[PDB]
Write a protein that binds this ligand. Structure first.
Ligand SMILES: C=CC1=C(C)/C(=C/C2=NC(=C3\c4[nH]c(Cc5[nH]c(C=O)c(C)c5CC)c(C)c4C(=O)[C@@H]3C(=O)OC)/[C@@H](CCC(=O)O)[C@@H]2C)NC1=O
Ligand code: NA
Ligand code: NA
Lengths: 260, 271
């Protein structure tokens, strides 16, 4: 089961369930049921070194939603330590210009947070967009509030594309606690409220209530992001984690959902 | 009274860096740049009351150049709190006859405590839509190495601009940094031994990879050229209203400001 998040802490799992529940409850009427094959919703490497679940609901064509994607990945690296990734993303279609949503936690007392509403128009060409969705919404405050904590530092992605893809208000953070319980405290009292308010902004100001050429560029740009990210993050790493057989079907199903 | 290349009010090392950079720009772009033709009262100007002083140096590219213009400035302002604002900047702007990145180096000090460095080749295409542009100009170059190198210094920390627009306009490899300025001798060392080589090396990439006195083509395609022109125009208009319209009348008075802002607007082609 997806919602059981069985390889992460109770605090982290609770955050992911709260988030996914909010997404599914608020967008009930505009979300289709998950149409992924059973062997793509829950899968593993034949050798047992990695395990993952995938939850994708397409949006209704008359809604602003392309799809929502939730995932957890567990990989036992040969060394003995486990990589746990938990993520929820929201993708909007070309009927709206509004930003996307992403929350991602990557953990090997150390943890990377990616929390953002990624822009879907060029911010330099379109400063009104920047004002509407980021300046008027106080999204930057979450980044700043988190950084005040001694164990929270900036995370600078090795991917220049990831750096370019996220908004100027993105919380790209590395959390380095002295113990496990300190990190857990940060998750419940700081990360959790932050992720929940960013989600609220997305639902109310982005999803909630266009130019012919504007939509054409939206799809072109949307596709460029999805295609490139899949190339960078999936094409090499999934065959490694799960084996070529399991990867081929899963990535095919992901590509189909992403429309690439 | 004080001229552009005199860089008054700043430390000897800050002056030297700015002199070195502008001299290199002009010397290396001899086949590109027309003489400065700003009138004397736009080249050097001040608030009549003495509270602010500035100098402006603009050289436009010739008709057939990829260079739109290069612009140098220094600004000194006496803030009513008794501290002084000192800005020194050099920017290279390319026109729509090339897609290649721009060049910027800025040093900003408004308190005794910290010197802010902005050092970048700002991108001129959407990097998400155009990942090939991202690879060509930022991945394939060593631009990020300079940011990493500078950041290793104990006195150097990330600078996060209050302007979301500034954050969006700089490249993913930009050195946006804040340098501890309490120890004067240390700041000089950081400027001389680390910031100076980095800025010169970033300029070198711009000169050789962006301006590229090579096959002066590609002839930029119709659609590409028009998008460059629109995005360039948007950036410039926005930058001026954020940093010039809302500050220059206050610093220099309406008389001097209207004159200087006009000249800047003319060079930027938003006039
Ligand atoms: C790619 C090119 C450039 C980029 C990316 C760029 C960025 C930044 N410059 C800022 C500022 C700034 N710059 C100038 C010089 C100047 N600007 C123009 C046009 O724009 C002209 C024509 C001239 C001189 C003739 C002044 C006066 C001035 C400020 O007052 C302001 C500032 O620091 O307040 C204390 C910062 C704004 C946000 C922040 O506070 O972080 C930010 C770091 N500045 C670029 O030129
Ligand atoms: Na911190
Ligand atoms: Na440092």
């Amino acid at each position: 089961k997806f919602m059981e998040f069985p390889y992460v802490s109770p605090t982290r799992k609770q955050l992911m369930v709260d988030l996914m529940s909010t997404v599914e409850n608020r967008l009930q009427s505009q979300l289709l049921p998950c149409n992924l094959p059973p062997d793509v919703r829950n899968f593993n490497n034949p050798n047992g070194s990695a395990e993952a679940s995938l939850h994708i609901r397409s949006g209704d064509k008359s809604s602003p939603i392309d799809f929502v994607i939730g995932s957890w990945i567990h990989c036992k690296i040969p060394t003995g330590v486990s990589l746990n990734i938990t993520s929820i993303s929201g993708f909007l279609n070309s009927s709206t210009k509004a930003p996307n949503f992403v929350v991602e936690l990557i953990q090997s007392k150390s943890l990377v947070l990616i929390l953002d509403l990624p822009h879907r128009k060029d911010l330099v060409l379109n400063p009104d967009y920047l004002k509407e969705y980021y300046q008027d919404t106080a999204l930057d405050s979450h980044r700043q509030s988190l950084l005040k904590l001694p164990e929270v530092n900036p995370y600078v992605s090795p991917s220049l594309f990831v750096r370019s893809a996220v908004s100027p208000t993105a919380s790209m953070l590395k959390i380095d606690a002295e113990e496990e319980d300190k990190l857990e405290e940060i998750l419940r009292d700081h990360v959790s409220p932050a992720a929940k308010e960013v989600l609220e902004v997305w639902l109310e100001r982005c999803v909630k209530e266009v130019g012919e050429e504007e939509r054409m560029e939206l799809e072109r740009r949307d596709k460029s992001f999805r295609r490139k990210s899949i190339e960078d993050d999936l094409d090499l790493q999934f065959p490694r984690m799960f084996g070529e057989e399991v990867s081929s079907r899963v990535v095919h199903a992901i590509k189909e959902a992403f429309g690439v």
